[PDB]
Structure 1
Amino acid sequence: AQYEDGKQYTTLEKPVAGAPQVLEFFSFFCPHCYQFEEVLHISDNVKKKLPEGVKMTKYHVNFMGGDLGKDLTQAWAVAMALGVEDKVTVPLFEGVQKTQTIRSASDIRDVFINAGIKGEEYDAAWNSFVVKSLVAQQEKAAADVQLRGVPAMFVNGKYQLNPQGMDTSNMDVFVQQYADTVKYLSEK
């Protein structure tokens, strides 16, 4: 067939009940994740092609970058809680990988401040139990799918995208194949 299990996607032998419809994992330390988000805009092109009524969830992971890596999962929880993801995603990626000016929790905080989030507001969120549970949600989703590498995308807790079965000669064409595959899986 055109889409075949084991080629553009794999099926989880051990399906995850109650998972988000479309779930993407990344790390701000992850070089391919930087490409995905900053150069390819995968999340966005996927979204533009998802059928109506299917929402997109994106979580940060702990297993890259050590201590700063966990800080970034907590910051991403703050980003989700305040709804400021589209204001901090670019400066966090560039701060960690381009300028390498993010070296501490305080440097992460600076990015949110630069972005117009008030200090009081950031700190209150950082220390909140609502953010603690969002950190918990991210860690559990990653644990549920055996997650050991990023970037990664899962559809309905049952299917995992397999971009390595895709031509990358053209960047535009790869992104749409990726997006079209997510839509296919989402209609399954």
Structure 2
Amino acid sequence: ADISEGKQYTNLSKPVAGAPQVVEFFSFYSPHCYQFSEVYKVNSTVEKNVPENTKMARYHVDFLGPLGKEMTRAWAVAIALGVEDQVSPALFKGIQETQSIRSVDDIRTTFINAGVKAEDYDAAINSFVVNSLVSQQQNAVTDFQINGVPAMVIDGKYKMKNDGISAKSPEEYAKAYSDVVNQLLMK
């Protein structure tokens, strides 16, 4: 049960100070992120089983997809309006399944169809709060040296290896992944 550097996780070369304890990086364009988030519920298993009071964060990355940057801004609006759970399925579906989200306008329509008030979306998208959530995400991707998604970094020091989990099923995988995050947190 004892984890090893290079096996289940790796050390960031340049550790990040003042970082949230668990930072998730994802893309609405990524098949593996879709599976993690929506099919096999890996990140939700991690979130539900960390210690009480663990400081967590979930950021979108710019580097996949035609609308990478724009979707990072939309994710900031989701965080700002508190509608993450509300809109995430529709966004994954629209980007990857029906492939019907192809402009900034489609992104907006997806929020609206998912029950987000148009007036709130339109105000949020140009707010200081959202401006800063955008730079926060972009800067984190750089500072944490994120090259691929999904990716989870613990205490600004340790990066999960998605190919390094010991598991024979999705159910075992979710639990083991969580077990590793928790062991990393106890370092």
* 1:4 counterpart residue number: 4
Q: Deviations over 1:100-154 (max 9, x none)?
A: 1111111111111112211111000011121111100001111101111111000
Runs of 4+ residues over 6 Å off in structure 1? none
Tell me the distance in 2 between the aligned counterparts of 1:178 and 1:165: 9
SS at match of 2:49: coil
TM norm structure 2: 0.96
Question: 1:39-78 maps to which residues of 2 (within 5 A)?
Answer: 39-66=39-66, 68-78=67-77
1:8–1:162 Cα contact (<8 Å) kept: yes
Tell me the distance in 1 between the aligned counterparts of 2:29 and 2:81: 22
For residue 17 of structure 1, report the CA deviation from its aligned partner: 0.7
Check if 1:159 corresponds to 2:158: yes
Tell me the distance in 2 between the aligned counterparts of 1:90 and 1:56: 21
Question: 1:149-188 maps to which residues of 2 (within 5 A)?
Answer: 149-167=148-166, 169-188=168-187
- Name stretches of at least 5 consecutive residues in structure 2 with no aligned partner: none
For residue 166 of structure 1, report the CA deviation from its aligned partner: 2.1
* 2:110 counterpart residue number: 111
* 2:38 counterpart residue number: 38
Check if 1:13 corresponds to 2:13: yes
2:167–2:176 Cα contact (<8 Å) kept: no
* 1:23 counterpart residue number: 23
Aligned residues: 187
* 2:92 counterpart residue number: 93
Q: Pairwise CA RMSD of aligned residues?
A: 1.2
Tell me the distance in 2 between the aligned counterparts of 1:56 and 1:15: 17
For residue 91 of structure 1, report the CA deviation from its aligned partner: 0.6
1:19–1:141 Cα contact (<8 Å) kept: no
Amino acid at match of 1:130: V
For residue 60 of structure 1, report the CA deviation from its aligned partner: 0.2
Between stretches 164-173 and 140-149, larger displacement belongs to 164-173
2:60–2:137 Cα contact (<8 Å) kept: yes
1:94–1:100 Cα contact (<8 Å) kept: yes
1:29–1:65 Cα contact (<8 Å) kept: yes
2:26–2:149 Cα contact (<8 Å) kept: yes
- Name stretches of at least 5 consecutive residues in structure 1 with no aligned partner: none
For residue 168 of structure 1, report the CA deviation from its aligned partner: 5.2
